[PDB]
Every structure is written in structure tokens, then in C-alpha cells.
Design a protein around this ligand. Sequence first.
Ligand SMILES: O[C@@H]1[C@@H]2OC[C@H]1NC[C@@H]2O
Ligand SMILES: O[C@@H]1[C@@H]2OC[C@H]1NC[C@@H]2O
Ligand SMILES: [Cl-]
Ligand SMILES: [Cl-]
Ligand SMILES: [Cl-]
Ligand SMILES: [Cl-]
Ligand code: NA
Ligand code: NA
Ligand code: NA
Ligand code: NA
Lengths: 659, 659
Amino acid sequence: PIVLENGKLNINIDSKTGCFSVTEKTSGHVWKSDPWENAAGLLTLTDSKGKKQTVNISKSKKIEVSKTAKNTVSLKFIDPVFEDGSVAKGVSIATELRLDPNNAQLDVEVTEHRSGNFTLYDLRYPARAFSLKTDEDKGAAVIPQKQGVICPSYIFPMNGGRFCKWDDATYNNKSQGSLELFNNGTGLTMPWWGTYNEKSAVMGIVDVSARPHMQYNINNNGQYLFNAKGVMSPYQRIVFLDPIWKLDQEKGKMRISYHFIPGGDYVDMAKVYQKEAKARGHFVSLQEKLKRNPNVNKLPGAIYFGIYGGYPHYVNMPGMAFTFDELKNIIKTIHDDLRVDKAFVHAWGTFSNFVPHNYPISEALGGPEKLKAAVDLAKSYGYLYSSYHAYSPMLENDPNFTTDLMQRDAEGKLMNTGSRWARVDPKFQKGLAQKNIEKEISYLGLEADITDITFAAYRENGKEGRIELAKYIDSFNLVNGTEHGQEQWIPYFDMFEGMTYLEDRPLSVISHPAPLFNLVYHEAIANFGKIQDPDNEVTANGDFRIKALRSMLFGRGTTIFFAPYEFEGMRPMIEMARDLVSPVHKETFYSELKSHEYLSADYKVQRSRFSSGTEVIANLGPVAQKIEGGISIPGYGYRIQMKDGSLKTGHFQVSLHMD
Amino acid sequence: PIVLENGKLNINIDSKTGCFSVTEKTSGHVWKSDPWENAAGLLTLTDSKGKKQTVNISKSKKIEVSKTAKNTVSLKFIDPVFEDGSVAKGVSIATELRLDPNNAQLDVEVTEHRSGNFTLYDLRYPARAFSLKTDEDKGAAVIPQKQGVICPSYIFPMNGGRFCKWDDATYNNKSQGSLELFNNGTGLTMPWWGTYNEKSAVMGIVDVSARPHMQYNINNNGQYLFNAKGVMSPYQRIVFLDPIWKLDQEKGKMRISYHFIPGGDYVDMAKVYQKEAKARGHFVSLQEKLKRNPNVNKLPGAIYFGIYGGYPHYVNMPGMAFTFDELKNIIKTIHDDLRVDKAFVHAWGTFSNFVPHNYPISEALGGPEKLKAAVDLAKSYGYLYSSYHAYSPMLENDPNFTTDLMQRDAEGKLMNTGSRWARVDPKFQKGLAQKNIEKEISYLGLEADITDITFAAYRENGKEGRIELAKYIDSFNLVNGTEHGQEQWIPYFDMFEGMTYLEDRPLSVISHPAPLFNLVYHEAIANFGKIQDPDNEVTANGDFRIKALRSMLFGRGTTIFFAPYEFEGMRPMIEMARDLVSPVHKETFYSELKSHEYLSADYKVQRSRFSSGTEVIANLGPVAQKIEGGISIPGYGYRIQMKDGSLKTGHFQVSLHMD
Ligand SMILES: O[C@@H]1[C@@H]2OC[C@H]1NC[C@@H]2O
Ligand SMILES: O[C@@H]1[C@@H]2OC[C@H]1NC[C@@H]2O
Ligand SMILES: [Cl-]
Ligand SMILES: [Cl-]
Ligand SMILES: [Cl-]
Ligand SMILES: [Cl-]
Ligand code: NA
Ligand code: NA
Ligand code: NA
Ligand code: NA
């Protein structure tokens, strides 16, 4: 066995298989290689017949493991063997393990692959590494899926219905699969993931040039590997997260940097990535944004109101569209009657053309002077205001629809025919914004802007055009927001609408929300709830009680998103957000979310500490539970220590009024 | 055209294509053939290269259409043509259209299929028939997906976040797909579906011997057919539901019976199927079940309580399992402190072996005498009691696990290796129940039983053994329940736990819950909420306010499902259920749900009328809304007219207590 060792880690590499273990010498915890098959890696490739197979590369005909520098071990896997015993002659995978001389850090890189006459597809490398043994390790996988989740490595008490779904999912396909980086759907928002137990933590950070996928296995014993053969899995239930290198498309450096943290958990992992986030240039603080634009200080304590008039989906839809006088009266009511001191008013439906032609201000809704009266009233309150804007859609029902501005692929076929909100090639979007946005800014005296869709993901195709648009919008120095966001866009915006949770998502029944993204970026980007899952709707992610409490724990702002006819029914939730969430949001807005903790065995009682001197404890479940010192937190209750020394305690109550 | 006609309907059959239209003569409404491609049917079959292709059978080389009896047209589609111009020589499809001589009913049957040297798979027939034109027809598709949904054929006002998801889904793949019959997952619980507009309704009833799937297309213009070619769809937005005959599997009679109802909607469709349900023998009334067993009258007004002790998933799990004295004290508190007058107590975790060995009563939990003490207390209150029982699982973590009782398929491979709760072959399950259930009935003096898993679906494979088990359980004449249920099991049980809604399901963002199953079967089977999604949990299906109101509209009972540590948090919901839902459940229990109506444009205000003389109006959204007569229903509010003429009005309020 070949050893790399420094003061902090011992890497033990098996010369027969290329598998390796990592001893974290402070805690003494040992991370084992693949517990199931002793596979260093899992390679998907075509056979002689053109059929895809997945093979254990530790079964290759020749495996060469040599110490090639003081702290580098080079590995080569030559001529893998298929299930029938034929050989993939001429195929090979070369990798390197590089131990930092001083730090508890191990770089792992796929340096070369050779396909011969076959075709190489997925490579899981390292395979089923850094795993947790279910119900032996008491820890979790840590996955930055949108705002982020943890997946405990053991079964624990919880509501009976939740428990049945949770345990069942660890025995079927719900607990295995893969996610991608930097999308606004099911995927990851930061290029890292990790595992920890009560002794030690490990996380891996993906090279900035690479786009592996992430395979997950959450307490599953691998029965999914055996269902087609109709036999029972012989393997043990474990938790692992693996990189999937897409050998058929990846042109970047296939490197992942593992960082080992004695006694660490998901908080420590997030703080390690926060250093890398700064080095990558993503981290531009809200304090720096405020120095550039004093109006950023209209955001702390603001409720984000989306008044949804059926636009962009329809122009002047009966029963949905608001007139500009109606918009003014909603703003007046929010301030004068509901006493909301700070607000971001976002009016969806102010133009008489379909996006991406964001003009003119609609005559049918009252015309420019009446919109200006509404915006002026909002400004007189100190509120931020934006219309709905988008430069990416090309909509079937728009009389101006054309395919002129849609992108085509190499075969001349239209792209995004299945995604109507993202059809305009980004290389045209700055020019579309230039058609009217300066006119609207000048006429309405705008202080703010929100732009939809374009910055919800960070994909390679079209990135240059998106950057051009972001730089143009940023050049106006408005308080500005965008849908969902990604870390790469943080330099250009003050707020993201979203970066919370999908309602239906892989892992939903076997994970707990954890504020991973905000543990990294709360000081750099403000976030609010998503308009599809706002704080006034009851969804898989909770009702108002749960969402208000989670908002304060995670450091996000309230979103109230409604059709005009619903407005009277929003009043009680606006008042509760005003009294409970808004003062905490205001106090914590610029601060670091220093720590988050789960304080109850069912993960429903949680404690967040912010560098404003604010501590938020809340109980997201129905039953009162005790914490340290015999302090009781009511069901749907909170205990919040403010910087001014006051202690806010209380809880939500549902009551039945029988007349 | 060939014409079949009676006093009610004119069937216009195109001799060149085999397509047909149906004129409903009293309204003048014409149901059209396929609006997109004029296809009588869509056949999937292999080509000469063995690759699957889907073809329009109206493009076949020879189409024969002739009147072969007074009210029968015979069609034959001979030698379909592939997209490359080659011919599926020797393939043919024979169908018949048979008009009832008197009634507005058309039978449509695939009578013969010949594959030659090709292989046949799906046949949609009739293809894209009985469609609704989006935003012109103001009606809905009607789909008995679990309890049931309707899908409106037009866009309407609703909450902004819901609206965005709804409208977007009609343009992407969320609005097209297929569902299967008689499962407990995403599929249908009755073998019918339909469409209606403001003039006319049509529904199709699938022959009892057949298992087609059902294709849906909910306001989609067919863009999914063109995405791979990268072109924009040239078709219009429509609603349709098609049978998919599985030619490779189906051995039954491939017949669907269309019933045409002037002025009808989903209520009239349900009442048509109710007559068929009675003719099929599924309908055994709760009044008849009460005559056989007077203890059935312990169900009306009963809350169903599941005390979830971590079993069957684990034996005596710390932090989840209750002792029998703890169980007794929960029952006592429910009666004495919470004043619950009727209840079904269901205790999950009474045995010290894993299911399917439902014995002995656990010594570690206090032993048989202590369980008998808790059951005796429940009986002294007039409550129903059952332990958790299951005869179908074979669990990995059971020391007694064996594959001996698992089923093997035609290849000799184990079945359900990925489905641990349904691994025992049904042909063994009566013998497993016989091992101890009569001992438990005798020792505890049981009046009730609930059996998990086995009756949640109605698949062909294993149905004989499931019927044998159902007959055996039924022979005890206990008040009895089972998980989820299907119509075919109604003769054997008094209640179903479930028959409501999955949390995550196809069509969720573009449909409204409708009580289709209970419009048929409320007089014959009682249902309660599902334990995974109980009324004390906040899910995609609502919080307690929404679920309590929907329960009264739909005629189901309350489910409170909790781990023991949660009990104190359940108290407010138990009290509200007791005050609001239980008296209405009690009054309506045995009655017919005669009608259900949506009374507001956003479908959130609804009115149900029961043959007890009870009327429930409720508002499942947040804003007060007015109905006929200017009567206002508050948000999360109700107006209930009881049998004796008294009026109950009220609403739920969420409030924030701040110390
Ligand atoms: O987890 C499930 C749950 O207990 C066993 C599983 N089968 C049906 C019950 O609802
Ligand atoms: O429906 C969507 C919604 O408005 C247009 C779509 N794009 C993003 C917004 O959240
Ligand atoms: Cl875009
Ligand atoms: Cl959140
Ligand atoms: Cl079964
Ligand atoms: Cl329901
Ligand atoms: Na999966
Ligand atoms: Na800005
Ligand atoms: Na679909
Ligand atoms: Na019975």
C-alpha cells in the first residue's frame, strides 16, 4: 500500500485496486474506500457491440500505482474488463492524488482518458468514497441543492407520516440518482458537497473549469443495482456522494479538492467554501453595494410584494390585470392601513406589448401619468418599485412572435422550442433591454429594477450575452434584483427572488432544509421567497407559520405574491410579517449567518446566529420542545435575542371561529 | 360519409380516413375527430429495422369502412405506412363502432389486430377524439385520478404563483402523458374519463376485462411532438384524453363505451358510472354493512387516530415506540380531556416480531395484559381499536427475512425486489394472517381490524390470493379498514384509509381536486385521510384549515397521524376537528354525495349537497368571496346547512402571539 502523509492526513492507497482510505489524524476517523465492491471508479462505456456497460475500473487488466512526487501518487487503469470477460483493449484512465504538504487537503484529478475504438461516457471517480455507514455514523450528507439540504445518515424520531415516507425512500429509487451544477431546477448552487459524522467532516470542491454531475445515495443498500437481475442486494446501507465526470463532453480540468475538518459539519464546510467563493470573485458584499448605492438600505426590513396582473403570460387579462389606479390604491393601503414601513413593490403587468418588448406603458391600464402617480406614491413612502421585465421570452400567443431571435443548433434546428420563457439568444438581450429601459428609468424616475429569467442559471451556452446584459443593467446603479440567481451573478445584483426550495424535488422526503447558500453568501446577496411558492401560499414547503420562521432562521426576506383580487385576504399575513419577520430581517440583513444548528432530535427546532448580534431560535413543528437549560420553544414558536437586548418570544396559533 | 344515427346522436364516419364525429342532436354540439392530423388512431409498432415508430393509421394503404349491421360500422386499417414511405405489409387493425339503438351511447372496440412480421405496441384509438378547444370551450377534462380531478379547458383567475405554474405547464411536458388504472400511485381509481363544455359532456367507460392506459393532453398545442425536430408546433391548444390499448399485453375485450350527456358535467358523469359500478358488483352500501354489523355505527363522527410507534419499519424503536400504558393514557386523554365522542384508534407497534409475523403482543412494551387494558378502555368509550397488521412485507432488516415467500416472474427472477412492503406473494397471505389474527381477536375481544398494503391496488397478478385474504378477513364481521382501497375491494371493507390525493402527482399544477370517487361510492365506503398526508401535517395538499374544509365538502373523515412525542401538539387540531368536521361527518356518513359545484372563478369556493339534507359551502382560499344572493364566504370559511335546518357559519384564523 502506497502512503501519502503529512501532519494532518494519512492517505493509504491500495496498489492492487487503486482504492484509497483517508485517516484524518486529529480525530482518528478513517474514510474508507468503496464498501460495496472495492471499486476505485465506475466507468460507463460502449462494448464491442455498441452497448453501454458500467465497469469497475479496479478490475482492469493492468493497474499501475506509483508515488511520482513527494506528495503525488499517479494511477493508471489499463484495459477494463466487461461482464462477459471481453477486454476494452486500448481504453485507459489516468488519475492523480495530490496531498497538500501542510494542510488537510487532497486534490483528486482525472488527468487523461483514452477510448481506443470504444466510446467513454460517465466516470464516477472516486467511487462510493467518503461514505457514512447508516445507523452507525450519526451525521449527514451535505448537498447545496438550491438553498441547501442535509441528509442524515441514521433514522431518527419525526412525525409518523414523514417517517414512513423517509424510511421507505431509503429503500427505493428515491434515494439514488444524480444532480447537476448551477441550474434553477433540482440542481446545486455551489460546486461542493460533503459528508460528516460526529468525529470528522469532508467536503469536495469542484474545479471552476469543470461540470461533473453529483451522484447521491442516501442510506440505500444498492438494491437498484440488482433489480433488473431480480436478486437481493448483498451490500450495506450507506450514504455517499460521488462526482460523475462526463467523459464524452467535459473539456475542463477534472479535479476535485477535498478538505478535511476535524469535528466539522455543514457549517464548517460552508465557511471553507466561502474562502474559495471570494477567491473566485463571486463575493461582493452588500456593504460595498450600499456604499455604491445608498438606496440599497431601502431593502432591510422590506416585504417583497409581487402584484401579479396575469402578465407576462397575458396582456390585460380580464379578472387578473390591475389598472394603475388600482395599483396605487394597493400601495396606499399597504403603507397607510397596514403600516408597512419598507417594501419592494413589483408590478407584473404595466406594458401593452408582450415581453421581450417591455413597452409602452399601457394605455388600457391608465397610461404613463397614472403609472407615474403610483410609482411616485411608493417613492414618497421610501418604497422600492419595479415593473416586471424580461428580455428572454418569445411567446406563441404574442402577435409579434417570430423565430428571428431564437438560437439554432449546428443542424439549423431551433433551440428552446420547449422552453418559451428562455428562447431569445442571450447575445440579443442587451439590445432588447436597450430599446426602452432607459426611457422607463428616466420617465418614472426609477430607483430599482427586477429582471426575470435570464440569470436563474449559469450554463455555458449564451453566458457571454448574459454577462453583457448583467453589466448593462448594473451600469444604471439601481437597487436591482433578478429571478433565482446563481453565485456567478452576485457581483451584479442586490437581491435574488428565490434561492430557496422547489416544492417537488429529489430528496425532499429524506432531507432537511439547511441554509448552506446563505451560510456562504448572506453578506453578499439578499434573497427573498420565490414567487411560485410565496409566503401566502400553502405548499410542500409549508404554510405562513413555517415559512415565516424559516425565513428568520435562514436570513431571507418575506415574499407576498398575489393576484389583485386576493389582496384583502393577504392582510393578516402582511401584518404578521410586519410584526415578526421584518424587524429581524432588518437587523440581520447585512450580517454574516455565522452558524446554524439543529437542536431537537427531529431536526425541527433550530438556532441561527448572525453577526449583527442576533440569535434566532425557532420550532418548525407542532409540539413544544425543550432545549438546553430546560427552555421550551412552543410549536411554530420562536425565541429571538435582538442586538438591543430585547428577547422576542411567541408562536403562531390557528383558531376556529364558529359564529 | 357513412352515417349511424338514432334519435339522440348522429355518428359521421369518414370513409377515407376512418375518423368519425359525433353530433349530439339536442344541443347541436359536434365532437370532432383528431384536430391535429386527422388520425383515426395512432399505432406504435416496430419497422423493418426493429425500431419503434408511431404512425397515423388513417395513412394505411387500404381503409375499409362499411355498415355491417343496422347500428354497427366495421373498419379495417390495412398495411400502415411508415414515415420513410415503406409499408408495414401484413399489419392490420380492425375496429367497430356500435351505436345503441335508443340511448346516447356509442361503443368503440378494437376487435382484431394482426402484426405479420412486425410487433405492435400502443394503439391510441380513437386518437385525440372528444377534444375541447382551449379558451373557447369553457369546461374541463374529468379524470378519476385517486379521489379525482378536473382540468379546466381555459385560463382563469387564481393566485399569481399558482397561475404562473398552471399556464407554464400547459406549454411544456407537464400537460401531456399517460396514467394507468387501479393503482395507489398516480393512476385512476375508476375505469372512466371524460370531457365537457358548457353544452355537452361525454365520458368513456372501459370494458371490465381490459386495462388500457389513458393519455392526457391538457391545453397543450402538441409542441412535445416537434421539439426533437426543433420546429414550432403548427397545431392549436386543445384538451383530450385517449385510451391507449397495449396491444403487446392486452387479452381482454378492447372496448370503451361512450355516454353523451347534454348539459352534463363531472357530477352527471359520476352518476352514469355509479349505475355501472352497481352492475359490476362493487357497490355494497354502508347501510347494508350496518345491518350486518351494528358496530359500523361507531364510525360516523369518528376521528381516525394513528399512533405511529415506528412500526412496522422498526421493532421497539427508541424515541418512537409507545408502551401500552402510554397508549392507554393517550386514549384516556382523547376521551376525557379532548371530549372526543367517537374514534378509531389504530396503534402502530404492538408486536415484537416484524410483519408479516404479526405476533406475539410485545413483552417489551408491557405485554398482553397491558395492551388488553388499553383496548378495554377504548371499548368502554365506544371507540374502535385495531393494531397495525400486514401480511405482504418481507423486510431486509427482519432477522426472519427469506425469499421463500416472494414471487418469481416467467424468467425465474424475484419480483418486487425494489418494493419491500409488497414482497410476499398474495397466494401465501391468507396463511400468514391465519397464524395469529384469530388469537388476537379472541384475546383482545376485537371489534375492528385494519390491514395494510394488500388492497391498495387492483392489479391482475396475484388478484386471486388477494381475494382469498379479503374473504377471510371479511368472514370475521369486524368493522374493518384497509390502506387506500380500490372499488373492487368495496364489498369486503367498511372504510378506506386514503382514496384522497398524492402530494406530488402529474397534473397537480393544472387541475382541481373534485370528489369523483365519493360522488360514486360515498354511500358504500367510508374514507379517511391518508396517513402519509394526515390532517395535522402541512403539505402540498394543504394545512389543517384547507384539509378540514375539503373533508366536509368531499365527505371524508379526519385523520390525525402522529408519533407519540407529538401528541400535545395535536390537541388544537383534534379539538377543531371535533367541533367542526365530526358533526358534519356524522350527519352525512351514510348518505349520497348528490352534487358538487365550484362557485367562484378561481374554483376555491365549493358547494356539496348530501342526501341527508346537508349542504356544505366552503372557501378553500384566503380571500372572502361572494356567491349567489350576495352571500359572502370568508377565506378558509364555511356555511353549512344541517338536516334540521340550522345554519353553521365560521372560518379559521391564523394569528401571531407575541409575549
Ligand atoms: O411505509 C408504509 C406505511 O407503513 C408501511 C408502508 N406501507 C403502507 C403504510 O402507509
Ligand atoms: O411563469 C414564470 C414566471 O413568469 C414567467 C415565467 N418565468 C419566471 C416567472 O417566475
Ligand atoms: Cl436566457
Ligand atoms: Cl428559505
Ligand atoms: Cl400485495
Ligand atoms: Cl379529500
Ligand atoms: Na432517483
Ligand atoms: Na444594484
Ligand atoms: Na408529462
Ligand atoms: Na366489516
